[PDB]
Each structure stands twice: as structure tokens, then as C-alpha cells.
Amino acid sequence: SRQKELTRWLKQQSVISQRWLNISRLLGFVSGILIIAQAWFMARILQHMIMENIPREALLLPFTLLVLTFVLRAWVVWLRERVGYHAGQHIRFAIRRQVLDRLQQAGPAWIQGKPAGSWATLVLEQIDDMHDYYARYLPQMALAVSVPLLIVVAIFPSNWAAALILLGTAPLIPLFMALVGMGAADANRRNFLALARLSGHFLDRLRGMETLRIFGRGEAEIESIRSASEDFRQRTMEVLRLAFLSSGILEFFTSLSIALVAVYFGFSYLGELDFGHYDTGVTLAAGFLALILAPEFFQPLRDLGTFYHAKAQAVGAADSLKTFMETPLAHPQRGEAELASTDPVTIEAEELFITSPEGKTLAGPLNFTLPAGQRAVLVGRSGSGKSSLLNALSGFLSYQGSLRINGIELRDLSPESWRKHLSWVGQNPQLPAATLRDNVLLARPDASEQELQAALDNAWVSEFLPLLPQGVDTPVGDQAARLSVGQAQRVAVARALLNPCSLLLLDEPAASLDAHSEQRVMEALNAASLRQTTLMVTHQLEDLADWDVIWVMQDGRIIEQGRYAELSVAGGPFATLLAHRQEEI
Amino acid sequence: MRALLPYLALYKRHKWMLSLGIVLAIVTLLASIGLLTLSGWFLSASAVAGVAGLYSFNYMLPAAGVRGAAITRTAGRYFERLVSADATFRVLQHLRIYTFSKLLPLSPAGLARYRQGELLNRVVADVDTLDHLYLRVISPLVGAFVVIMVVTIGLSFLDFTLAFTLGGIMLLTLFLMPPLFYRAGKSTGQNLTHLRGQYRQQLTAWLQGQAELTIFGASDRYRTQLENTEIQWLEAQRRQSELTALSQAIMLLIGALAVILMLWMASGGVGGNAQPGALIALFVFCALAAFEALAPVTGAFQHLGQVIASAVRISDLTDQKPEVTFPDTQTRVADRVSLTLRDVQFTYPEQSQQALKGISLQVNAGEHIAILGRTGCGKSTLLQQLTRAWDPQQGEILLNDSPIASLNEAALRQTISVVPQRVHLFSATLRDNLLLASPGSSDEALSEILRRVGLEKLLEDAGLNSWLGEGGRQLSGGELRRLAIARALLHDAPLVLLDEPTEGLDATTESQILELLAEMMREKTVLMVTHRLRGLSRFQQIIVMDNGQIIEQGTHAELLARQGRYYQFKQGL
Ligand SMILES: Nc1ncnc2c1ncn2[C@@H]1O[C@H](COP(=O)(O)OP(=O)(O)NP(=O)(O)O)[C@@H](O)[C@H]1O
Ligand SMILES: [Mg+2]
């Protein structure tokens, strides 16, 4: 239903590398001339030695010209394939560049909305689906209208009956393809839902093979696989029985045109058919020209049919890439005001409404104040907007209201300079660098080795380095494969403790860690949370008596605020929250 | 290549449908050559005969040959495309059954060694590639070979030195060129799969660590590093197309060589005839049309490397030895199962040597047992040993006075109904997600359980014919927990194994689950493993676990009356 405007998007993305698609259209015209020259030289050579009985040694010039047109024709086929690739490559490099540009300025707020395996599909597997639309389908659609018109133009002076046989099928092919194309469109729609259900049936019975085992349904799911495969087979054979007629319409008219050209020329040579020629005896070279060129008239149409799948999956790729590039989402504004000093900051919020990039409000009205050097705690149930406040405080989320850091509002604070005074630790630590040493030094690449070693000593990461093979320079691998979740989270602590900061945001560290790493992370992060303003989200709800204030929220609003002593005995929401933690071992 | 042998042997079934789809490809592809070689001879014979030779020349026989060759060229292609596509769905069904029927005996162990999400998405893709062997590889290669051998044999009746130079040229590029271009692009194809996965991992690390990179100022430094990998990745994609542009310019030159050779060689005579006449065109038009047979042959050989690679992955995955083996006795299932465990381990032993000797416990018939474990201290493996996922290396399980290894799978799955922590929602109807537990249940019984369990919100929309799963409606935790319990109540086994049933559930739903176990599973010998203390009062003989061993045991009141680790757990911390 969206084909017309999706294809308009596809055809507008091709303005880049327009000279590659212009050379490929011009090389398809040149290739259609070498096809005609090939058939004309063969027809004259064949006539000379069949009718005039000229020896092959007296035909050296036509043979030389025939070999030359074969070398030129193979040259443009090589040239047209390389030029066609360059067309597709430059759209893919430009679309990917502006997909990664949009996906970076949107920031982590929008990226985490979808799993990273689904972003890699968009950037790496769907952008590449558009290559064969520009490399093959678009050039072939030019070859399908350029070359066939050249054969008709080339044959017409010699014999208008032969050119009428080829031109006569030009309207009759799309007429019958559309006649059977609408009989194969209702088959798609009346089997669309069932084939969608039946496609993921095997992977579903294969993921849930644990549940089948414990219930003893393994031998009864073999029959369902059989019954679902029989149903899928015969349901999609009805679609294919009509989709193979459309391809068989073209094979019918290329078979009828070759047969009919042979009969017309064969019978006219014997005197059975007088029409067709321009009041002159039909020569043998005229018949060979029309017989060599008859299969070449329909070859561009046959090759285009093999490239239609390229257009189908390019539109499916443009289906998801057009919506992505036109989603209305607004970024946090970046005022140019550098922070005054590298001292602990006094963050205070008058009335905040932290909003996602799509406009949804994540955290309701927030009324709080964190004085310089004061460490707070955010606690609450899941989905309560605890992490949304830390992302907004980092600049990743747009807010309406007043959130002033050290007296200056966050909206008019320079993100380049504000984030130099911001260090933070998040749950599920991400290690982007290559080596463990270059990953700690990511925070401050200019760190000295004595400052670097102190960070590794303070963060309790040098006490598991000997377990690592290469030590400090151990390659972390993909998704921190080498390091355990507890060990990687301690490395994330190391680069937080490297540079002194004016504000430390700990978004639930040591949450999913093992028992020993949780003790080591918290100990190294509880003594580092009392030398600058920190803001820790946690679910531990215990040993918080040393923290200055506790902000508990549900549904994105601070409901209770105070020290641990006054909330544990107050019986309020914190006590209800604290009782849940003690309920589970 | 010996990898395809277990999968070629799958063709013995449907070996007439598969052979027909290749014969129809040869007949179609011979009619295409016959249509153009007979037309070329007919035009030459008619022109040589001339108007004066109208009556002497029998033109009706060739005119019926061109009509027949055109019908079987267009009818043959339609039927070859149908049988080939039909028969490639019949071997896909066989491949799907073959792997599934062979992955069942090693489902828990030997298949979950990998990452389940990434592995199973590759098992499905690899069976699809094994499905491509017949139509992408075997059919183009075999069809090209015997089309060459028939035109060579056929043309050898007129001339022998001409049929073999045309046949020899076509046989040389059938056997020498597809391997020659597979060797040239092998290095690039390896360098292409490395760079595609290197860009994939650098992009995921860049997207996932966008919060980290932005704050530390490396977001644009690692984007340059990411773009340089793409530039290297695109260079390796030029070289793959620069070799495809060369394999296409060479097939055009080889087919040119076989036409120029036919023109030059066949004009010197065919059967000793000084002036061949119409026989020249029969050879140059066969050579002109016979290279359509070799069109798919290079791409058929490239895909053969993928099919062989996919054949090894499926083979080495489905050829593992199953952990457990079941006897065949058909012992009658007995109600009132009295489970007995003797020196069986409860948790995978840590390098810390948690428990060299395992736990021991007796669960009499009808008893409800709850096991308390420290959160995050190892993982419970009591259910896998009880479900016979793997044989216990130490200790033994006595299921109602008899060892658990002496039960056939049919009986074992009937004495034990287990509700796992990871409850699977099959993409099927609500009836099919419940008849899984009990195949013979009536329509009312399934709805009766759903009302009784509390899944009443699942009966107003289409009743039990609601699509649950990937293509339909998802179920939330707690709404999915009560489905797992619904199956176990429908299964009706004497022994029930609960695995953290109230995990990740809010206190409103969690209190409703514990009532379900105490009410419906009143006489079903429940053995429950949890990390919570909410409803342990109703359970008999609470077992507290420390370091993989039983430190405290007894009733809730009995265990609370005496000071112990359960007392500390109840008060907090
Ligand atoms: N970047 C975002 N874009 C859109 N929706 C979001 C975003 N971040 C959070 N949400 C949603 O808005 C609500 C805020 O949740 P959230 O801020 O994550 O609370 P939370 O305390 O972090 N949950 P948890 O970490 O499990 O304790 C939830 O319903 C989220 O699904
Ligand atoms: Mg959070």
C-alpha cells in the first residue's frame, strides 16, 4: 500500500552516485548496439558461406570485425558490472552515514529503546538490502527499454514483418502478466496470515524444546511439524502455481516469437508467404539477423524478472529506513555556558518533567535539592523513573522546568564542558575500548601511570588482574567476554575513579554482580561517593544509614525524603519498600 | 564434501519427485537449444532450396519440429519450476523433522552449551541452506552436464571433430571455470566475513556504550574507527564484484569462442562435405544457444561451499551423544510418589569446594517440601536431575522405592509434572498451549482450569482459539506463571516440582500463586525451590540450604522456635 512513496524515497536516495547510474544507462545502450552489430556480422558471414559459397579465407574482415564486437561486448559487460556496484556502494555509504548521524545525536535515550541486535539489523543488514536495487534492478530497467527498442529499430528496415512479430508481443506480455498478477494477489492475501503463522513454527518448537521434553510431547510435535510443513507446502504452492504463470507468459512469447520468425522466414524463402518484405526478395542475412536477435529481444525482460526480488527487499528495507529517518523526536538543547569551577555542584530542581525523545513524560514533578558534597539515594519500585532522573542529569533526556546545577540551568549548559565535570557508573557496564588498560584510561587518556595504578588499586581491579592471562593489557573481547559481570563492573568503577568529578551518578551498580564483587564495588564506591556530590539509584535498601538523604519515588514523583533513621521507623512507603527486600532471602 | 552424505541420503524419500525436477530442467533446456538450432537449419535449408524447391523440400516436418520445440520449451519451464519448487518443500519438511527428531534426545545438555538465542536462529538458517542444495546446486550442475553430453552426442552424428570441439569447450568451462573462480574469491570471501563481523561488533559496542562514550568524550573518536572498518569492508566488496565482473566477461568470451570456432571450422566441411551449406548454421546456432546451460553453473558452485559449511554445523550438533538413556519396560505409573534423595548435589560445586558430599532428604507421599537457598550463591540443579536432564554423577534419586534411572520416558514424564522458571509460550492457540500438558482434555476442562487458576482474562477473546505467542498476544509475568501452573494441574502427575514459582511477581499476585499451590496441589507431593519466605508456613518440613548443604530442617514453627539461620532470614538480612 506504501509502494509509491517508499519507491519515491528509494529513487530520491539515488541522487548521490547519479553519474554511476547515468554511465550504467549509457553502457546499456552501447551494449544494445554491440548486440545488433554482432548479429549483423554473423548474418552476413553466414549468408556468404551458405548462399554465395565464399570460402572462409575470403571473409577475414567480417571475422575480424565479429571478434572485435565480441571483445567490445564482453568489455561493456565487465564495465557495466563495476559501474553498477559503484552506484549501489555510494548510496549505502551515504544512507548509513546519515543513519548513524541521526542515531548518535538522538543519544542513548532513543538507542536503548530497541535491542542492539535490532539496530545492527537496521544499519548492517537492511541498508545492504538496497544494494542490488541500484546495482542491478535500476540499470536493468533501463536495459529492458533501451535494448529491445534497438532490435526493433534494427530489424524494421530489413523486414517489417519480423519486427512486427517482436513488437507485437511488447503490449501482449504486460497485459497477460497483469491478468494473472491479480489472480496471484488474492492468493497472497487469503494465505498471508497463515503463512506468517507457519513461517516461525519451526523456530518456535525449537526454542521451546525444553518444555516439550518435560511434558513428553517430543513425539507429538514431530507430527505437528509434519502437519505444519504439509500445510505450508500446499498453501504456498497455490501462490507459486500462479506466480510461475507470470514468468511463463514471457517464456511463451519468446518461444512463440522464435518459432514464428522461423516459420515466416522459412515459408517466405520457399514462396509460401509474399508479404513482409519491402518489395524485394527476402535475403538469408535478413532471416539470420531476426533469428539471432529474437532471443536477445526478450533477454532484458527475463533478466529483469530475476532482479524483481532485489526491488522487493529494497522496498522492505526502505519501509523501515524511511520511518526511522522521519520520526519526530527532539533533542536536549545545548546552550553555550561553560561551568564556573571544578568544584562539587549544587543541583536543585524546581519542577521537572523529564521527557523521552518522542515526547512521553518519564518523571513527574520533582522537587528536590542536593547541596554541594551531599550524597543522595534514589529508591523505589521498578519502572518508577529512577534511572530517568540520572539520564536527564547527564544531558541524555530533555526536560521542561528548572534543573539548575550550581545555580546555572542545565538546558543552557554546554554539554562538552558539563560532561567533563560529570563521571558516572551504570548498571550492566559497557566496555567499548580494546584492552583493559585503554578502557580505564578512556576517561582521561592523559593520566600518568602512578595515577592510573592508583585507580586500579582503589577500584579493586588489580586483585584479579593476575587471574587474567595478559594482565592489565588483556583484550576484553566482544561484550566483555573475558571478564565476568562482577569483574567488568569493577573496571567500570576504575574509570569513574580516575578523573575527579563535580558530580557522580551511580545508576544501580553492584546490582546483578556476584557476592564478592558486590562487596568490592560498593566498598570502593562508598568511600568515593563522599568526596563529591553523588546521586545513587539502588534497590539494596540496607546499610544506607551513612547516606545523607534518601529520595523514594513511585510513578516518577518524590513521595518521601529524609535520612535512613527517620524513614525506617516512620512506617511510610520506604518501610513498605524495605519490608519487601527483607522478605526475599 | 563428505559432509553432505547424511543429507543426500535424505533424498531416498521423494527420489522420483526430485529426479523429475531435474529431467524437466534438461528437457526444457534441450528444447531451447533445439528450437534455435532447428530454426537456424530450417532458414538455411529453405533459402538454399529456394522458390524452385518448394515441392522438393519437405518443410512440414521442420515446421512441426519448431512448433513442438516451442511448446515444450514454455510448458517444460513452467512444470520444471513447479516440481522443483514443490520438491524443495518436501525435503525441507524432511530436514525439519530430521533435525528436530534428533535434537530431542539431547535437548537440555548438549544443545544449551551454546547461547540458545543465537544458536537456534542459526539452526533454522542452516536447515534452509541444506534445503538449497537440490535447486541451487544439484539441479544446475547436473542439468548442465547432461545437456552438454546430449548436444555433443547429438552433433556427433553429423560431424565428430566439430561436436567434440564444441562439447569439449563446454565441458572445459563446466569443470575448470567454477572451481577456478571459487579459488580466486576464497580469500576475499573470508576477508569479507571477517570485516562484516568486525563492523558488527564495533557498531554494537558503539551503540550500546553511547552513554559511556558521550560522557568520556570518545563518541566521535570511536565513530571514526567504526567508519574506517566500513571503508575496509566496502573495499573487500569491490574485490568480490570485480571478480564477478570478470567471471561474466569471460563467459561471454568463451561463448564467443565457441561461435567463432563453429563458423570457421564448420565452413570447411562437416561429414566430408566440401560445401556444408545448411549444416553450417546448425552448428553455429547450437553453439549460440547451448551456453544457456552453463549460465547458472558458476553461482551453483559458490553456493556449494555454503551448503557444505551448513552441513557440518548441523552434523556436529545433531551427532553428539545424549546424556541420558532410558530403558524400555512400560511400567505402570503409580500415584502417591514418595521421592527419596540420597547424597545428591543441589548446586554445581564452585572452585571453593562447596559440598563434596551432597544433600539427603525424604519426601513422603503427599508432603509439601520447600527448599530455601541463598540468592546468587550458585544455581539449583535439583530439577534437572529429577527431570533426568543429566545423570547425577554423585548420589542417587529414589522415585517411590525404585531408582529414577529405571523408568521409561513415557512413565517418567507421567510421575513428574514440573513448572520451570522459564515458562515457554508456544506460538499457537490457547487450546494448544494447554493440551500440551494433557492431549485428551475436553474443551470445557481447559476453560474450567483457566477460570480456576485465575486466567479468566484469556477467555473472552475468541475463547480458547486465541493466538498466543510470536504472532499473537504476549503474556506478562504472573499472567504467564499461572499458565505454567495450569499445565501442571492439567498434567496431573503425582509429584510436582516447583522452581521459584513466585519469582519476579508482585506481592498481590504472588500471594495468589501460593494459595494455588496449597489448594489445588493438596495431595501431589510438591517439592518447591524458592528464594523467598512469603508463604513457607503452609509447607511441611522446610529445608534451608547453605553452601550446598542442609544446615536447618523442619516445620516453619519448629524451625522458628529454635534460633537458627531461618530465624535470621525471617527478621531480615
Ligand atoms: N529513554 C526512554 N525512552 C522511552 N521510554 C523510556 C525511556 N526510559 C524509560 N522509559 C520508560 O518510562 C518509564 C520510566 O522507567 P525508568 O526510568 O527506567 O524507571 P526505573 O527505576 O529505571 N526502572 P528500574 O531500573 O527497573 O528500577 C518506564 O515505563 C520505561 O519503560
Ligand atoms: Mg533503573
Residue numbers in the entry:
A (entry chain D): 4 to 588
B (entry chain C): 1 to 573
Show sentences the authors wrote.
Here, we used cellular, biochemical, structural and computational methods to characterize the structure and function of the heterodimeric bacterial ABC transporter CydDC. We provide multi-level evidence that CydDC is a heme transporter required for functional maturation of cytochrome bd, a pharmaceutically relevant drug target. Each subunit is composed of a membrane domain formed by six transmembrane α-helices (TMH), an N-terminal cytoplasmic elbow helix oriented parallel to the membrane plane and a cytoplasmic NBD.
Based on the deduced sequence of binding events and the distinct interaction patterns between heme and CydDC, we reasoned that the interaction between H85C and the heme iron marks the most crucial step of substrate recognition. To test this hypothesis, we generated a CydDC H85AC mutant and performed growth-restoring complementation studies and oxygen consumption measurements. In addition, we investigated the effect of the histidine to alanine replacement on ATP hydrolysis activity. A lack of this highly conserved histidine residue abrogates the functionality of CydDC. Furthermore, CydDCH85A could not be copurified with bound heme and could not be loaded by the exogenous addition of heme. These observations were confirmed by cryo-EM structures of CydDCH85A, exclusively adopting the IFasisolatedapo conformation, irrespective of presence or absence of exogenously added heme to the samples.
